[PDB]
Each structure stands twice: as structure tokens, then as C-alpha cells.
Design an enzyme around this catalytic site. Structure first.
Site, mmCIF file in Angstrom:
data_model
loop_
_atom_site.group_PDB
_atom_site.id
_atom_site.type_symbol
_atom_site.label_atom_id
_atom_site.label_comp_id
_atom_site.label_asym_id
_atom_site.label_seq_id
_atom_site.Cartn_x
_atom_site.Cartn_y
_atom_site.Cartn_z
ATOM 1 N N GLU A 35 -1.212 51.106 76.961
ATOM 2 C CA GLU A 35 -1.351 52.099 77.987
ATOM 3 C C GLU A 35 -0.372 53.195 78.316
ATOM 4 O O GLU A 35 -0.711 54.507 78.184
ATOM 5 C CB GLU A 35 -1.908 51.514 79.187
ATOM 6 C CG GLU A 35 -3.188 50.585 79.085
ATOM 7 C CD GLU A 35 -4.413 51.385 78.785
ATOM 8 O OE1 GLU A 35 -4.258 52.704 78.978
ATOM 9 O OE2 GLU A 35 -5.436 50.709 78.651
ATOM 10 N N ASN A 46 -8.372 63.272 81.573
ATOM 11 C CA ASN A 46 -9.709 63.160 80.696
ATOM 12 C C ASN A 46 -10.379 64.453 80.840
ATOM 13 O O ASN A 46 -11.316 64.370 81.855
ATOM 14 C CB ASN A 46 -10.150 61.879 81.242
ATOM 15 C CG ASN A 46 -9.282 60.727 80.864
ATOM 16 O OD1 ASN A 46 -8.696 60.415 79.877
ATOM 17 N ND2 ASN A 46 -8.955 60.114 81.993
ATOM 18 N N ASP A 49 -14.489 64.234 81.832
ATOM 19 C CA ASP A 49 -15.041 63.633 82.922
ATOM 20 C C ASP A 49 -14.290 64.033 84.103
ATOM 21 O O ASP A 49 -14.539 63.741 85.279
ATOM 22 C CB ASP A 49 -15.496 62.250 83.090
ATOM 23 C CG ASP A 49 -14.287 61.280 83.266
ATOM 24 O OD1 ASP A 49 -13.348 61.524 82.807
ATOM 25 O OD2 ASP A 49 -14.502 60.282 83.977
ATOM 26 N N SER A 51 -11.371 63.201 85.239
ATOM 27 C CA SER A 51 -10.738 62.186 85.773
ATOM 28 C C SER A 51 -9.040 61.998 85.456
ATOM 29 O O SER A 51 -8.990 62.645 84.135
ATOM 30 C CB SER A 51 -11.132 60.613 85.935
ATOM 31 O OG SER A 51 -11.225 59.919 84.627
ATOM 32 N N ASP A 53 -5.701 59.181 84.554
ATOM 33 C CA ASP A 53 -5.289 58.022 84.325
ATOM 34 C C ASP A 53 -3.934 57.750 84.762
ATOM 35 O O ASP A 53 -3.104 59.123 84.334
ATOM 36 C CB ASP A 53 -5.274 57.419 82.866
ATOM 37 C CG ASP A 53 -6.770 57.179 82.461
ATOM 38 O OD1 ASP A 53 -7.471 56.807 83.246
ATOM 39 O OD2 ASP A 53 -7.030 57.864 81.289
ATOM 40 N N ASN A 60 -7.342 54.649 86.471
ATOM 41 C CA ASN A 60 -8.258 55.660 86.603
ATOM 42 C C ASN A 60 -8.626 55.973 88.183
ATOM 43 O O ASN A 60 -9.126 55.268 88.640
ATOM 44 C CB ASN A 60 -9.585 55.538 85.733
ATOM 45 C CG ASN A 60 -10.410 56.802 85.592
ATOM 46 O OD1 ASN A 60 -11.176 57.172 86.549
ATOM 47 N ND2 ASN A 60 -10.060 57.539 84.557
#
Ligand code: CL
Ligand code: CL
Ligand code: NA
Length: 130
Positions: A35, A46, A49, A51, A53, A60
Site C-alpha cells: 500500500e 483517486n 471518485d 476520494s 487514500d 480511504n
């Protein structure tokens, strides 16, 4: 902060991650590795959408932390996403525990499915004294 493998392993164990909701320490290690590369300041927008991370576990903003700019988002961890960018991973770990408390468990992260699930993940903790 960019953690060294064994330093992180020992830290996670002390924070009680080993076997949390049935997830072995080696799995948490495999997750952090893919990750963020063990980097607590990693962020990833991202565009698809809106959002983002955040941190070592790449948690998220749509469901777990509040960053204010994510549409129709909730804050299940009851934290500012900023908390997930600290060198001290205590808040990130408590939020990760919250995430896996949902039915999907560790499967909530697609990266875990792609690179950890059904694999020999021993390598992530070998020689660390945990
Ligand atoms: Cl906070
Ligand atoms: Cl907040
Ligand atoms: Na949120």
C-alpha cells in the site's frame, strides 16, 4: 516517516495487531508494504471518485476519515485524515482495526487480494524477532 521492515513489525506487534480479528502480523506487513512501501506520509488521490487514500495503510477518505472535500463521505474512524499522516502510527493502527471489524476484514483492501492472499507472506516478518 519511512519504516524499516523489522522496525515496523515490532511496532505493530506492540500495538496489538498480531492476530487482530484473525489477521496475522505477516498479513498486516504485506499490506503496508504494497500500500505505501511503509511510508506514513503517502497520499493518493483517486480522480475517479474524488476520494484520497492516506498514510501507511492507505486508508480511504470516503468511509474512514474526514478530509472535508470527499463527496458523500463518512468518518467511521472519527478522525481527521491528517491523523493518518503522522510519524506515530497509533491513530492509523486504531483506524485499521476499525476497518477490519467490518465483514470483509482484510479483504477490504484490493491490494491485499492481489499480492498477499494465498501467498507465502512469512518473508515480511522473518528475522524481526516477533
Ligand atoms: Cl483527528
Ligand atoms: Cl475532521
Ligand atoms: Na470521510
Amino acid at each position: 516517516k519511512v519504516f524499516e521492515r523489522c522496525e515496523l513489525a515490532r511496532t505493530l506487534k506492540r500495538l496489538g495487531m498480531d492476530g487482530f480479528r484473525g489477521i496475522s502480523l505477516a498479513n498486516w506487513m504485506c499490506l503496508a508494504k504494497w500500500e505505501s512501501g511503509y511510508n506514513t506520509r503517502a497520499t493518493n488521490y483517486n480522480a475517479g471518485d474524488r476520494s484520497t487514500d492516506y498514510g501507511i495503510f492507505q486508508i480511504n477518505s470516503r468511509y474512514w476519515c474526514n478530509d472535508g472535500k470527499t463527496p458523500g463521505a463518512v468518518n467511521a474512524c472519527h478522525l481527521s485524515c491528517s491523523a493518518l499522516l503522522q510519524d506515530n502510527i497509533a491513530d492509523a493502527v486504531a483506524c485499521a482495526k476499525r476497518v477490519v471489524r467490518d465483514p470483509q476484514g482484510i479483504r477490504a483492501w484490493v491490494a491485499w487480494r492481489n499480492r498477499c492472499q494465498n501467498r507465502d507472506v512469512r518473508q515480511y516478518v522473518q528475522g524481526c524477532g516477533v
